Amino acid sequence: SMLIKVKTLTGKEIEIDIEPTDKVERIKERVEEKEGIPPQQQRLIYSGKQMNDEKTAADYKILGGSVLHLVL
Template sequence: MQKFTLTSSDKIRFVSLSLIPPSKMLIKVKTLTGKEVELDIEHNERVSRLKEKIEEKEGIPPAQQRLIFSGKQMNDDKGVDEYRIAAGSVLHLVLALRGGF
């Protein structure tokens, strides 16, 4: 490591780096049967789009899907960033089946 000697007439420039999250991240969706589905998503993607991706992979219509993260049901109109979902997060998929008589 190199040492530098500073005097009162020296100028130091500080550079501020903002932490920009990567645009894509990999998350997992776990079903009640224990099956895990990996999804490559944008950090600001809408929950409704996640459900569409699950339908593409698993054939489950979005209307029948309920996604749970940190014990809370996720709202279709919100972005995953609003739930603080990060790369490696695990969401839980519950099916909302309609009963009838």
């Protein structure tokens, strides 16, 4: 239900909608569903910590409008 944008290196702010109890795998797959980057070549960076594929988004204290870092 939340709204987040995955900022790429170029600068394109990809807006995506996730749930309060979403998963890192689902968040990464959302980028592929709208950006095309395969889930096996994505490394989300949030608050200087490498996003894990198992921890839920709630453990990372993700709030609406938070800019996410994606590096290919």
